[PDB]
């Protein structure tokens with residue numbers, strides 16, 4: 059496989075489906091990346107993560123640098139070997155205070171170095187993620203700093219031959235909710251040049267309507283021929299709408315975290331499995347889901363497990379929710395390839411919100 | 413398969429190896445039964461429990477009657493269906509205050525009824541487990557009460573046709589550390605008649621030397637042609653010594669509980685994986701273990717997981733420890749069948765305690 063190749067196989071409106079080829083494997087897009095902050099996707103073995111359909115997972119510069127340490131993981135053979143995942147890993151840069159970086163120490167150069175030490179396949183530029191709400195002045199200052207940091211990221215990555223030759227580098231667009239700042243950011247990133255482009259600074263309290271409004275003008279500012287990654291998104295309906303606006307990649311803690319908290323995603327909407335109405339419900343979590351959890355266990359059992367604080371409850375809820383997300387992405391991919399994504403999006407929503 | 417058949421295939425001293433045939437499957441003896449108190453063997457899917465080699469698991473009258481409720485589990489199709497384990501289940505009776513029973517309500521009749529509602533394959537008589545130390549008078553009174561309760565258990569089980577026809581009933585010997593009381597108890601149980609006989613009231617603070625001393629005279633008091641179950645035992649070396657004294661069945665929370673606490677069993681002795689000496693140790697938990705955990709993950713990773721409080725840490729430690737216990741039982745079975753168990757016991761100990 060090449061270091062990096064993104065091919066678009068089909069389109070419908072702003073929506074795209076295709077593949078990212080990398081040395082450690084192929085990524086089908088639109089893609090959902092399970093999050094694994096402490097070098098584990100919580101409560102799941104990697105084979106289970108893979109079984110659910112994930113092609114790529116997300117790791118974190120900030121958390122791993124603190125524990126167990128980036129140098130330590132490199133000494134032990136890198137993150138892939140350490141946690142037992144041999145497919146691509148994307149690492150966030152720790153961006154989610156001086157011009158040099160952030161002490162708490164992280165700078166563009168150290169960030170890129172840590173991602174190298176971890177052996178990340180898709181490296182994110184080190185940014186400043188702009189709080190919401192932000193005045194235009196502050197959003198501008200922060201965006202500008204990020205673009206400077208973007209160039210610094212690019213140069214550090216490029217200066218490390220093994221990294222430049224085997225991994226990919228994504229730039230992150232900032233600018234808050236302001237169209238002109240988003241455009242300046244996109245321009246700057248495109249001029250520097252990256253393997254893919256993320257939309258940063260969303261999903262930070264602005265709400266779906268505003269998020270979608272910003273996506274409406276921001277995603278077409280990015281190079282069309284490269285992947286578009288929406289960081290930190292999101293709920294199933296967020297994902298569908300974002301794909302309708304041209305997003306190809308997603309990460310989110312929702313399926314894992316809310317799973318351990320009793321929230322199960324279904325095609326009929328989320329449910330909270332701890333509610334007493336499930337205590338004698340022999341149906342599986344979701345009626346159509348193909349995952350092994352729904353093949354074998356009842357709502358009633360899982361209700362009991364979660365109420366009892368049992369680890370198997372977290373395990374089963376998490377496997378189910380990640381499988382659910384992967385099935386969602388598969389149905390998205392399939393409908394775009396068949397040119398019926400807009401109808402799928404409508405059908406999904408009618409039933410999810412019924 | 414029959415309701416119950418115990419066949420002894422080989423012997424060495426007091427040690428025996430054979431099989432218990434029951435409707436839901438065959439149990440190889442000497443057997444280790446993983447404990448699953450809240451209708452789950454903590455942090456493991458049943459398929460994983462089975463993969464490690466378990467033939468039978470243990471469930472609990474006391475815990476399940478409280479949550480989620482025995483009637484409720486029966487309504488949902490029984491414990492096997494509920495938790496997804498289709499092989500034999502042994503249930504303890506809640507014995508671990510008046511002549512009628514125990515309010516907190518449990519009596520022999522209710523206990524046997526709850527085990528029926530759960531659909532247990534091996535039902536334990538409802539006993540009074542005698543605290544240690546006990547004076548002879550108190551041990552006698554408690555033992556006598558248990559024998560009365562033993563008869564009551566037998567009659568309740570026998571009065572329930574479906575139970576009597578498809579499950580088995582084990583009696584529990586009491587008597588503390590006193591030979592004459594143990595003998596009276598054994599006699600009483602044999603006169604009533606059971607499918608198997610447990611040695612109760614040990615492993616309750618007396619220490620290995622005393623436990624083994626009591627086993628020395630107590631196990632030969634039990635019918636030779638029926639299984640001998642030591643309740644609540646134990647550490648790997650406890651198990652070996654108890655088999656040398658004629659025990660065929662064991663249950664214990666140690667492998668699961670101490671696994672979540674960072675304790676890993678190895679042929680070189682237990683280790684505490686959280687100790688800093690493992691933080692960069694790329695060897696698997698145990699050098700010879702065949703389990704999937706040791707096939708794939710390092711001490712270093714698991715050290716990190718447990719230190720970080722990650723659920724995967726509990727999962728991997730628990731799978732390993734239960735596999736370890738099953739491997740122990742397999743080596744015990746094999747060496748007895750080959751007439752080299754005494755040599756195995758010596759070799760085991762030399763290395764485990766080196």
Ligand SMILES: CNc1nc2c(CCNCc3ccccc3)c3nc(N)[nH]c(=O)c3cc2[nH]1
Pocket residue numbers: 093095116118150151152153154182185186187188230257258259260261262289290291309310311
């Ligand atoms: C939930 N909304 C949200 N997430 C955002 C992230 C983090 C992406 N998720 C990875 C992660 C997982 C756990 C802990 C920390 C990070 C961002 N990362 C960066 N670098 N820059 C952003 O603008 C930015 C914006 C975000 N909004």
Ligand SMILES: CNc1nc2c(CCNCc3ccccc3)c3nc(N)[nH]c(=O)c3cc2[nH]1
Pocket residue numbers: 447449470472504505506507508536539540541542584611612613614615616643644645663664665
């Ligand atoms: C650890 N030492 C010990 N365990 C003993 C048990 C319980 C066996 N293990 C099942 C279980 C697991 C978790 C919670 C409760 C029970 C006994 N059970 C009964 N019925 N009678 C005993 O004499 C008796 C003596 C014991 N000693």
Ligand SMILES: [Zn+2]
Pocket residue numbers: 343344347348349350351352353378381382
């Ligand atoms: Zn499912």
Ligand SMILES: [Zn+2]
Pocket residue numbers: 697698701702703704705706707732735736
């Ligand atoms: Zn192992």
